Structure formats: C-alpha cells, structure tokens
Amino acid sequence: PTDHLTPTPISYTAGFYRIPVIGLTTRMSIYSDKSIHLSFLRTVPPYSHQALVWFEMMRLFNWNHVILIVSDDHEGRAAQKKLETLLEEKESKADKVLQFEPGTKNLTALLLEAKELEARVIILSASEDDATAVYKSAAMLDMTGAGYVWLVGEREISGSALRYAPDGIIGLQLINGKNESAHISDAVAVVAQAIHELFEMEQITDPPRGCVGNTNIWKTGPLFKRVLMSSKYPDGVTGRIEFNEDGDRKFAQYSIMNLQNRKLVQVGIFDGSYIIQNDRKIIWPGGETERPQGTRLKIVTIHQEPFVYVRPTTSDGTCREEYTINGDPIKKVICNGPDETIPGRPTVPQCCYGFCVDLLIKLAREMDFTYEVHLVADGKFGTQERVNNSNAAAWNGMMGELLSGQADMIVAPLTINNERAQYIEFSKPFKYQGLTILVKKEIITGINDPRLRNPSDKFIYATVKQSSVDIYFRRQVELSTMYRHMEKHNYESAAEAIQAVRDNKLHAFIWDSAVLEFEASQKCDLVTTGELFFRSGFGIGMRKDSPWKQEVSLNILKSHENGFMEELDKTWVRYQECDSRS
C-alpha cells in the first residue's frame, strides 16, 4: 500500500464517463460520499460501517454511555457521523467525543480530559501508527485497566498497533477482507446479473470507445449503477450482497476478536444485523471471568466566609475536631487552592469545611459519586474577559474551570443568572437571597437610595470589581449610569470589603445577603438594610451535557422538603447577638 486509497484515481477517471467502478479491497471510508466519487461501489463495507457492530454491541450490554476517540480526517469524522446517526434514532448520545489529529506521538492531555468523563467505556478509530501512540499514551494513565472497556476497528488490532495493544480489548476483523479472489468471483457474478438484467432494458448505449475524442459522459452508466446497486443475488461466495445508498455494501460479516494472553482469539462472530456468540469465554481488560462494567468528581470553590472556611491542615495531621454550637463535631475535607501567605502563589493543600461541603457529602451519601475538591486559583468565581478577535479566551475563574473541565462540578455560593445560564446547566437553588447593603449601626432607604442617586465623593459606596453585582451593573441598561459611581474605589475580596466598613474606610458596602447577613450576626456593629433586590438563588454549576445535575436538582428539592437546609442554615447562621437597633 502506497499512502492510502491508492485506488483513488480510477474512481475519478471512470467517474468522468460515469463508468461504474467496483472495489474489492478498499475498505476506505472516503469513497462513501457520492458527491466526490459518484461511480464508486464496493463489495466491502467501509471502516465507518463497523459502527453498526458497536451500536449492536452497545445495545446488548446496555451501556448507553461511552467515549469516542477519532483521528481527524474524513475517516474518523465519518465514523463519528455514522455512530452518532445510529444514536440519533435513540436520544442523541454524545456522552463525549474526542478528536485528535494524526501523526501526533503524544496524546496524553486529551486522555487526561477523557478520565474526567464519567462514562468508562471507550471506542476508538485510528491508523495503526496512530493507534500505537494511543495505546502507548493510554497505558501511561492506566486506562487499559478494568472498569474500562475498549472497542476498536480492524486496523487498530493489526500491525505495530497489535504489539503495543492492551489486554482484554475488543476488536473487529472483516471476513475475506484480505482475499481479492472470492470478491472477484462474486463481483463479476453480480456484474453479470446486473448486465443481463440491464439488456432487458432498451435505449442502451455502448461506453465511449477510447478516451480520445470524447468529452461527453455515458448516459447508460448511472442506470448501470442503479441496477447494479439493486442487483440482489443473495447467494455468493462472500456472503449476502445488497448495497446501501452510498454504494457501500450492506449486511457484511465481521469476526469479533479478543486479546487473550496477548494473542488474537475469536470470542464471537458477527453476521447480518445480529451478533453471534462463539463458545469462547469473554475477556475484559485486566482480570475478569466475566466483567461487563461501565467515577470521580473534581469540585471547585471560592473563599466565601459563610458557606466555606479555610484553615491549613496542621502539619501532616488533617482536620480539627471542632464542634458546632449545637453539639456535633464539625465535618471537614481537603482542598487545594491559592495561597497568598507565601510571596509567590503556590496551589496549596488546605483544609476546608462548609455548609456547601456538608451538602456535598449529604449528596455523596445520597449519590453514587465520590468527591475530591480543590479551590480555584483565581479568587473570583468568574467573569467574561480578555481578547477582542472572534470571541477570545473565556471567563476567568472557577466557572472557567468548569467549562475547561478542571472541575466537572462547582460547589460554592454562586448566584444564578441568564448570562451564565446559556453556557451551563444550573442546579435548583439551595438558597434564596438578594443583594443588600451593610452600614454600621451605631449612632440606605432602598435598593434605590436617593443617597446612592445622590452620590458623593464624600460618601463612598463600595463593591468588588468582577463580582456578579458588577455584571448586573454592566449588563443592565436602566441603571447603567449608576454603575460607574460603584466602580470607583472597588475592593478585591470579601474580607477586605467587610473590613472597610468595619475600619470605617468606606461608609457603605453592597453584596448579596447570604454572605452578608451571617456577618451582620457576626458583628452587629454593622447592619444590613432595605429589601433584598436582585432577588436570586445560589446553585451548583454543571455542564448542560452532564445528566448528573438532573439528579442533583432532584436531590436538592428532596433536601428542601425535609427541612435539611433550614437546619443547616440554622447551624451555620449563628443569630446569637444582634437586633434591629433603632
């Protein structure tokens, strides 16, 4: 074989005159598009059609969740289209899809992205050389292990790829793919049947004599193609013969192959639309007598005082036995996050305990999932930013990690808004709260305060730039004038913002109540005033594509009805000392 699709020219050359071409050995997918090769028919199905098996395979074992790894070319993309089209009849299933470009020796990062996806079954299509790199990279991350499944194309099991191939893999081989001759006898048989069926028709014309002097197509040729595609003759040396719309063969038979003891064995054979199980024992990767099996959540947060607390683990020792005001020991978990304590900023191992953590573990007992949490590097939750061309970069902060996949799920005190909402799915609100203002009691009429409306350099009103409140100010046209006065003298973080009012540096502070009221209780030197405006709720972020959120909301509601939240707010909102001062 020289390069690939060495029978490319003929399909073009005959194609000019519409002379039908029949390939014996070209399993190549790029010939399936009628547009580019319109005369092309074959006695073998392309590599893309192999997906018919996988869907049937997927069908039997009941794994609806898989991952697809394809090379980037007409071949891989066609395979993806075919499988997805198969899935389209079902609710469309793009559990995940992963595209890599050919000739790339190191694929590690992409698989690192793959592990995060919950679905543990994998299917891949690539060239032999690429497949070597795929298995080579996959073995490094130990994705060849049990609990993971591999489904593959004929090319992948063969060649150098076979050498580096993982154990327990599932594989395919087309029958009589190597033999031209059987396909010869049969193809010619079909041609004969087609012709004899053809000459039954009239107004036939012989094909052009010689290339020279003929600029015109051959009117019969498409007809010859039409009969030939419909030409039956089910009895053949190769197996049943019928042709799909693309001229590709239908109802071909493949032999499933297994890697047992690092050698190829036939576990079963596939013929027609139904798989057949050979007597041989099933093998899965790693040790399984039978194991049809088909697990982690990376969680991200921000440092917000009421719903999250940060203390480092004492030396190696983990977490304090510190107890809630109601006698209970405080629960805690480990979180890796930004540290400003060192002059440089290392992502630092830390201990974090919170309302959201108790909620998360409550879910974790309720939900099949297991959790590992690290705080986002940026102190900000997230905001759209950076470069002008096209749309460039992405909103900085934990949200950005969610789209990036650095964390698959976000647990924090996040207000829920439409601008964000289009990008991601949002869990039903655990909490309901609205923005408000903190000012010291000890001697602001409304959300609309004439005092705000009458701004003063002398009377400050302070906020955090890139806080969602700022997004409210920028996005909203109606108050758009009022935004700028707030923009002046902004603070970077929550602690500093509360402190300014406490330090009396700033006369007023504006933030959502859930973070603020707890503090209002905490000091009572400071007070919240007016009516919660921008009334909103706090919820757990997930990608729209992830179905776990469907349970999450379903769980959130279940947690609301029993009063679990009420008791949790009751625990974490102290309420001890404060009152309406006047």
Added chain:
Amino acid sequence: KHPNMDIAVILVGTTEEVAIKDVHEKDDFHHLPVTPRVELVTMQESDPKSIITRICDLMSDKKVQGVVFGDDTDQEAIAQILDFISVQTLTPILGIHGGSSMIMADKEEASMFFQFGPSIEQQASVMLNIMEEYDWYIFSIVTTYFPGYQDFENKVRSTEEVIHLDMSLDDIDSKIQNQLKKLQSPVILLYCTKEEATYIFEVAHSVGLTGYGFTWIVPSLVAGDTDTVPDEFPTGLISVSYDEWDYDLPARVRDGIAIITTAASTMLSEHNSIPQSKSSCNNIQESRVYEAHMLKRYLINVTFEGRDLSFSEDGYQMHPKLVIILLNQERKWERVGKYKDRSLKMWPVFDLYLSIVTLEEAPFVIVEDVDPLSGTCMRNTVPCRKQIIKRCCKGFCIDILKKIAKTVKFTYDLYLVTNGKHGKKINGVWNGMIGEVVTKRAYMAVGSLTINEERSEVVDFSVPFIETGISVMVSRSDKKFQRPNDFSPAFRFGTVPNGSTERNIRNNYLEMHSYMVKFNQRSVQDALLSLKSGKLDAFIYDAAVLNYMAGRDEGCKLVTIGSGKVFATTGYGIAIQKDSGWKRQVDLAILQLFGDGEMEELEALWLTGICHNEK
C-alpha cells in the same frame, strides 16, 4: 546570477485551429527579479488522456515550475483533472476561463490549484444580495449531489425547502419531478453541473415551475461560458458570471503569468532561492519540491497593475469582479448588474422582467371602526384585517411603522392577531403575534409588545423607541408587595394575565403570582374599573400605558408610583424572524426618527396627557 523561470500555458478551443499563438508573454513589468521563459501549446478538445499526456509531455526534462490552463469549453470536470496533476506534481496550476474557472470539490490542502472563478460562498452571497435588492424575502434551494453542496447550504445558512437529489441512479421515477412538484416558493436557487441543469429544467417545465411569478437564480456553473445556451433553460433565469467584455482572455492570461512570476519574485525576496523544479511526473517528485508548500503560502494573495489577485484557502480568488446577468428574451445573455468586493450595484429600477400583525392597545395601537358611508379608511388610519371584517388601525405603532416604511422604502400588509394577542406560553407552545412570526405568517410583529430574554432568543428585536416597563398606578421592594398577610387588613394588587409582566413575575416572584391570580383583570379598561370605583387599591401594568393614563384621566384621580421610575427598565421592540432579516437597516431607521426629533412631537401629540398638570 540571471534567474529566468520556466513557465507553460495552454489554450483549448478558441474556435480556431491556429488558435491565437503567443499573443502575450511580451515583456511587461520586466523589473520583477525573475524573467519568464514561456512555452505555449494548444489542444483542440478536452480529454483526461490528452490533457494528462500533454502536460506530462511538456514536463519532460523541461522542468516547468508553473502552468496556466484555459478553455473554450463549458465542461465542469476539467479543473479537477488538472488539479489532480497538481496533487501529483506539486507544480502550481491555475485557470482563467471556462471550466477550469468553474467550481470544483474542496481542494486537497497539500495540493496547489487555483481558479479565476468566484468562490461558491461568494457566489451565494451575491445571490443573496440580488434577492435582497428586489426584496424577495422568501425562497427555497434545489441542489444536486455535485461538490460544494453543504458548503453552499452552509454558506447560505450563515449569510422553505432544501432538496438533494443524486443525478446518479438516474430516474425512471422522475423522482426529481415528484419532489420539485411539492415546493410552493417564489424564488428558487439551483445548484448543479451544467448538464444537470438542463434535465432539472425540462422536468421543471413539466412540473410548471418555470412560469408566472416564480423565478430562478443560478451560480456560475450552469451559465458557464454563456456562449451556448440550450433553451431548455427558462427565460428570466438569473445568474452571475465573469465578464468577457471587461477584460479579454489574453489579459486574463497576463494576470495568471503575472501571478506566477510575482509569487516567484516574492519567494525570491524572502529566500533568494530559485523556484525552478524538475517537472517530470512519471518519476518520483523532484527533491526540495516538497519544500514548495511555502510557495502556496506566498502565492495566495498577489498584486500587480493596481489589481488584487488575492485567493482564498480553497483556491478561488477572494473577490474577482463579477457581473449580474439575465437571460434576455430569446437566447441573449444580457448583463443586468455589476458587483465588486463588498458592494453590489444593479441597473433596473422596478418590475424586473412583508405582512405584519398587531394588536389594539389604544395607547400604542388604536382600532377604530371606519365610516360606513366612506367605505374605506380615512387620514392617518391604515387598514388592518381580523379573521373572525376590516378594522382601521392608527396610533403610535401605525405612525412609527409608517415613517419606517417611508424611509426604508418597502410596502407591507397589516392585519390583527386572533389567538392570544401578545404572545403567550401555555406548557410547551407559544401563542400570539409571535406565533405568526414563527409560522412565517408574519415577518415582523408591531405593537406595545414588551421585550424579554425568551423572545429575544427566538426572534431578533428592534432597539427600544420608548422608555417603559413594569409600573404601578394608584390613588393618593418594601416586601409589602411580597406578603399581603403581614398587613392585617387584606391588601390588593393585580395585573393583566398572559402578559410579559405576569410571566416575569412567575419567573422571579412566585408568591406574588399565586396571590395575584385572584386580582387579575379582564382588560385595562376593566382593570381600571377595579381601581377607579374602589374594590381594588393598586394596579400594575406597562409603564408607558400607566404614564399616558396618568396624564389622561376623567379626573386626576390616578397617579404613578414615586417618580414612576420603573424596575425591569425596558422599551417597546419589534419582531423579526431570525439572524436573517433586513435587521440593522431597520435599527438605523429608528434612531433617525429621534435623530430628527420627530419622536418628541409624536410624544406630545399621542403620548402626552393633560394631568400631571400641577407638575
């Protein structure tokens, strides 16, 4: 020292044996660092064997580094063939006329091939400009499996029915007749090979699609040379093509040579390296020819004679000058339009060769019963029909619409909505004018309609002309609204159901909705009856209507809340279909209205109330 490049050019056809030989290649722009060495050859009729053999034959030891192809032929296929040779040789080839210029499948990236025909995408764009110019809004696409489909479908999508039929598996069924018969649309875009257009057209002639009000629009390929036109094509057929008159074929060839030698000069300037390479196809491609890729990278945009040859990744030139052409009666191809770069210009004014729905608000749209004796509408009143009778609409929407129509210069049909007035959602489905906007029974919906995220999502909205929103009207965030029960006497407030206000309320504030359902009122006059005669304390509604009603009352018994400064600050917009619409053109018109200060006058006349008199 002396860097003389080796180049070859071929002409096919020309309607002559003894086709004009070596007319060009005469030294021009000699200053360019490499001087061209040219060998010219001609061949009479095209073949895959003849062309392949000859081009390889010229390759010999000759070592030509470039080729230009030109033809008298209408043939689609030729370009691809020469392109194939290019893929094999890595020797640049381009073509200036006819089939080579005719579009082809997406070129292999490694391969080097160029065409002086326009880009498929560009052509689709021009077709769209043409339809927009005549304001033919509604159209369908008939296509064939030939290459560029779905590059075309996608391009149209980005910029009624889409049909894909395989010419292969040629039909006894007249399957094309069976589909084509279905489409009811007035303006049809067709895409196919030159030969295919004939069959599709004979079939259309059987179907009755060529006649009377339907019109067809075509890309470069079908018209091809334009020298030969089977009359199977219907008359009034509209299509774009490159002009022979502007520049003759030798001038075009001069352009090609100039591109090749300019690319050679620039590549020289960069690496001081001879582009010359061994031309022979039969053996393996010459070494360092693999290096040639950068040439393509250099060659994509080239300029000489104050003229840009810049290509696109596909290998079509980025913006060659183009002409809008029509089939004049009989066999004539007579030019209609010129189009270049960004902009298009067309000659004929008129008759070459939007219906709107509203609802009555009496503040932004007033229905009146026309004088029966007169039999038709009077003065500012414009007709609107309601399926159940002619009603006469006049008011703010009528006037704004009227000015807009005057400025953008289009004509429109106005009717009244039946189901659900302003759009309303019950479970899964939309209702109201928005329905007629979605059903395409209406292009644009006008009225007192408020704006919201959902409707902006489904349909593009015009910029707000007026300051409005939710507001309160009473006689004379505190949570007094949030609960009535906190106050021992029962409090009362209500709004009109199926409103953007009620939906917004249900979205943000549930308790208020669930409580206010009892206080909901039939109509604004009746809601007013609940406020005015007692039995209701406060009323909530659109801010513009509440302000106009504040100004206009039988007694100044009613006023706004606070400064009438409204939350949910919004304005009245106007519906459109989707990303495809006159769109921005409308928007400009709108702020021109305020730009001349008309809106203040219209505000004083229509919006201004007498109350708010003590000011």
